[PDB]
């Protein structure tokens with residue numbers, strides 16, 4: 011951690027904060043200058059492919075790529091070899107399903123939540139359709155709070171359990187450690203979608219009891235696009251079948267066949283996103299300078315003021331009322347305005363928010379709504395921004 | 411996207427600071443990146459950073475427009491329609507997606523034909539599919555230079571379900587007769603898959619001319635783009651056949667807890683947030699390449715290969731691949747008798763010349779030729795004859811020092 015003012019010192023590294031009030035962090039974060047500079051350095055000063063080529067540029071790129079893997083492993087409490095780079099969380103979750111497919115038999119059971127983003131639902135639906143599996147959903151309420159008694163009943167006899175850490179639509183923070191303990195007791199593989207928690211709060215594989223965990227660098231970690239992570243706990247190394255194979259994944263190859271190399275390269279086919287890995291390690295180091303605790307504290311300030319100000323204007327908001335279980339995401343609706351209209355009006359005031367179903371249609375259907383307006387934060391967002399937002403909201407509500 | 415007046419290679423080198431520091435002859439592994447490509451990407455990250463998918467707000471609109479622009483630029487570069495372009499992470503992802511998405515079409519005993527010179531990414535997926543489903547995987551005959559026997563190709567491709575070939579060999583530098591192989595596959599009713607990872611950005615790559623049904627390339631190679639962006643072309647006639655291997659956010663029209671319906675191409679194939687920055691960077695590399703012109707690129711590279719190979723012959727240093735330089739790309743693999751390729755490469759590195767050594771992810775090529783690996787010097791338009799002369803001078807000192 012370093013000494014700095016929050017949010018001011020972070021804002022100074024993000025020129026866009028001078029132009030807009032960016033409340034669409036759940037979709038993607040804004041990117042600080044030092045992350046762009048780290049990537050630029052690769053492209054202009056040490057550009058090369060990895061895999062320990064003899065030449066000095068490849069040696070440098072290889073060292074920085076390995077450094078970056080180790081940075082990511084330490085960020086989530088994993089070992090170097092348990093970190094695989096992918097393009098995004100969605101790729102990572104697809105690879106889990108694809109790579110474990112062979113272990114299932116007709117009738118086996120998979121359990122998830124009813125609030126999953128499509129990327130943590132479709133792959134399991136496909137697998138369940140292909141193999142004749144049972145796909146069950148833990149009961150929960152309209153705020154996103156899961157029924158843990160029901161979770162114990164459902165996870166019992168489950169082959170695999172997949173859950174999101176944080177809902178991208180509702181902002182609910184699930185009791186992932188509790189669910190992971192339940193899964194471990196029952197002998198179920200435990201897969202965590204951490205796309206909305208990484209970089210916003212602590213994410214640790216050992217604490218969560220994760221067997222597989224996915225996250226996206228472009229979200230909370232303040233990294234670039236095109237870089238995702240898939241954590242594979244070591245005990246699955248020889249069980250997980252790499253879905254993508256080719257250059258970089260082998261030890262030997264003849265016309266007649268092949269032999270794969272060891273993790274993590276075993277799972278990384280072709281030239282990785284070397285620039286993106288370097289940028290994501292820069293973003294994790296930038297997050298570490300600020301500190302996760304300061305980030306979580308700042309975001310709770312924002313959520314508390316926002317949700318109190320919407321209460322004053324009688325604007326309904328979704329998700330947990332208990333703010334200790336509410337991440338930096340506030341979904342809401344203005345009675346008698348479609349959420350795209352609210353979004354458009356806010357855009358006119360240079361406030362960026364998202365509208366619609368948020369790739370979580372089953373949440374919208376469970377709630378009986380077509381979508382929501384969503385304001386989401388990061389540590390560079392300020393209470394002054396929130397006040398400006400609430401002023402615009404007030405005028406909108408007073409206008410009718 | 412129009413050619414401009416330029417001095418080659420000087421006016422390219424001015425945009426690549428590393429050319430002032432090293433002689434970079436490892437372009438087959440990855441290209442050096444011009445400043446304008448970096449600038450374009452920096453613009454996204456610092457000036458219009460947002461996710462795509464037409465979010466209501468202005469930054470999402472700007473990002474979505476630039477992402478769609480970049481897909482059009484890639485489509486036009488290869489002669490495809492917008493909707494036939496899917497972004498991936500690299501060529502290797504693209505070729506794996508082809509095999510995973512077409513696996514369902516095969517029946518036990520169907521035949522897949524490829525070359526014996528394929529990079530592992532255009533071999534392993536077909537080996538896995540053939541082992542799993544009980545298919546026949548055959549290899550067209552060819553010589554040690556990489557020249558395929560087209561008579562054998564016709565024989566093998568008759569009755570094949572799918573044909574997969576590389577346009578250019580990354581180890582040998584052979585340019586295969588892809589148009590002819592594609593004509594054969596079209597005339598025999600075989601699906602034609604082209605690995606263009608070593609051709610894109612170095613010569614013309616056009617899906618119509620090649621008779622491609624699927625085509626893969628990497629942005630970080632000849633197109634002078636960033637890492638982490640690849641392309642998969644899927645001809646429209648396969649939209650009702652090809653099963654998306656990766657599904658989830660951005661791929662759907664509707665979802666319930668009981669199931670889902672997918673959207674239309676190309677979003678049907680693109681699960682989760684794309685590499686928006688990398689697609690923008692790749693479109694900038696393609697525009698940079700269009701200003702230079704593929705013809706100028708091919709001409710410059712040929713001059714470099716011609717002098718390199720002639721100079722190696724003067725040193726009695728053996729080199730691989732075709733002797734007919736019209737069929738030899740900007741890649742020269744060689745070996746120094748008595749010296750392991752890694753040790754050659756290290757001597758070159760001492761002299762600030764960057765080459766690659768080893769098997770080049772093409773073990774069957776090495777095993778066919780009876781060698782363990784090679785030293786490989788590979789070029790781009792920014793490489794100069796001056797550099798080749800420096801290299802030849804260092805090779806001369808090495809050989810005299812043995």
Ligand SMILES: *[C@H](N[C@@H](C)C(=O)O)c1c(COP(=O)(O)O)cnc(C)c1O
Nearest residue numbers: 280281439500501502529580607608628
């Ligand atoms: C890339 N080959 C080089 C990395 C090398 O020979 O050193 C290549 C691929 C794989 O591209 P990725 O971007 O996925 O690594 C596939 N086929 C060919 C012909 C080449 O050159």
Ligand SMILES: *Cc1c(COP(=O)(O)O)cnc(C)c1O
Nearest residue numbers: 098099100127178205226682683
């Ligand atoms: C965004 C998100 C995903 C998908 O992330 P991508 O980077 O778009 O693949 C998955 N799950 C959750 C909870 C998300 O917020």
